[PDB]
Design a protein around this ligand. Structure first.
Ligand SMILES: CN1CCOc2cc(S(=O)(=O)N[C@@H](Cc3ccc([C@@H]4CC(=O)NS4(=O)=O)cc3)c3nc4ccccc4[nH]3)ccc21
Ligand SMILES: [Ca+2]
Length: 296
């Protein structure tokens, strides 16, 4: 993988490699997403979930949400990638989390970036001001939060008002990942990814983790690609056989446009090459990543 990395860097062909992936990516219909009645349920007109992999809400009225199930068979992990909830789809968002039995939510964007809203404030910012989603009959409360320099982890209590049942949801919010950009370093990214892994949120005993950014494809795709490749390197007899370009094409069978720039693709290689050191037994990199990330 790093041999390929070196060659691409030397040739300066990242844009070409990336364009080839865009050209070869699957193109499946998004008929439901495009129905007139779903116009206000989509944040961006050019980012829709494929019908075959879309997550269906459990309701007779309208079961649509701009979200896709990415099921990576070999890696044995599923992720739900979705757009940043809109003011009218926050209830749908949490209904999906409840129905799919998700334990964690990974947010890679900020509500406002460079003066523009990119996502609705779908969770409570104050413990004393909980939220009620009347359309889906759910209540959400901020229990606590651990604020680090570039990411915050929150403990949320989600309650199904119909049954009084409650569940703890972990919110992993990466706050310094610019739009169409990359994390400050492979170290800061990996430190965060392993925080999510360590929480148990990605365990197969839970429903798929919900990952989102603004459109749910650029930053969200980078996060999932790196995680899946690391999973495969740890599982295969020979980790050097992991073809990140092939893994990305496989993921794009489930949702369009995953990885939005050639540099996010290059960053994925770097994150996986760096992350591989831990997978192969290096006991000092995890700690090194934390120091490098300056999370305190
Ligand atoms: C072609 N063209 C020129 C540029 O501006 C737009 C914006 C939209 S639009 O209706 O505002 N649609 C947006 C969709 C969109 C929005 C945000 C992102 C973010 C990129 C990232 O790193 N993470 S993400 O939150 O997925 C990815 C994709 C979108 N589509 C684009 C196509 C080319 C370049 C930038 C784009 N942003 C549609 C077309 C165009
Ligand atoms: Ca207070």
């Amino acid at each position: 993988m790093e041999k390929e990395f070196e060659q691409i860097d030397k040739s300066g062909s990242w844009a070409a490699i990336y364009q080839d992936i865009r050209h070869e990516a699957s193109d499946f219909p998004c008929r439901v997403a495009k129905l007139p009645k779903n116009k206000n349920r989509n944040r961006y007109r050019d980012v829709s979930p494929f019908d075959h992999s879309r997550i269906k809400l459990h309701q007779e009225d309208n079961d649509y949400i701009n979200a896709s199930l990415i099921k990576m068979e070999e890696a044995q992990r599923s992720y739900i990638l979705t757009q940043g909830p809109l003011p009218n789809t926050c209830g749908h968002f949490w209904e999906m989390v409840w129905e799919q039995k998700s334990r964690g939510v990974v947010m890679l964007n900020r509500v406002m970036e460079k003066g523009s809203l990119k996502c609705a404030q779908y969770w409570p910012q104050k413990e004393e001001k909980e939220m009620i989603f009347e359309d889906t009959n759910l209540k959400l409360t901020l229990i606590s939060e651990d604020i680090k320099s570039y990411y915050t982890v929150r403990q949320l209590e989600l309650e199904n008002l119909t049954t009084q049942e409650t569940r703890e949801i972990l919110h992993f919010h990466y706050t310094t990942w610019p739009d169409f950009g990359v994390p400050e370093s492979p170290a800061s990214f990996l430190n965060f990814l392993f925080k999510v892994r360590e929480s148990g949120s990605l365990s197969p005993e839970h429903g798929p983790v919900v990952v989102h950014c603004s459109a749910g494809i650029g930053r969200s795709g980078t996060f999932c690609l790196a995680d899946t490749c690391l999973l495969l390197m740890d599982k295969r007899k020979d980790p050097s056989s992991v073809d990140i370009k092939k893994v990305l094409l496989e993921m794009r069978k489930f949702r369009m446009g995953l990885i939005q720039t050639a540099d996010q693709l290059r960053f994925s290689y770097l994150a996986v090459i760096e992350g591989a050191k831990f997978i192969m037994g290096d006991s000092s990199v995890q700690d090194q990543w934390k120091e490098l990330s300056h999370e305190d």
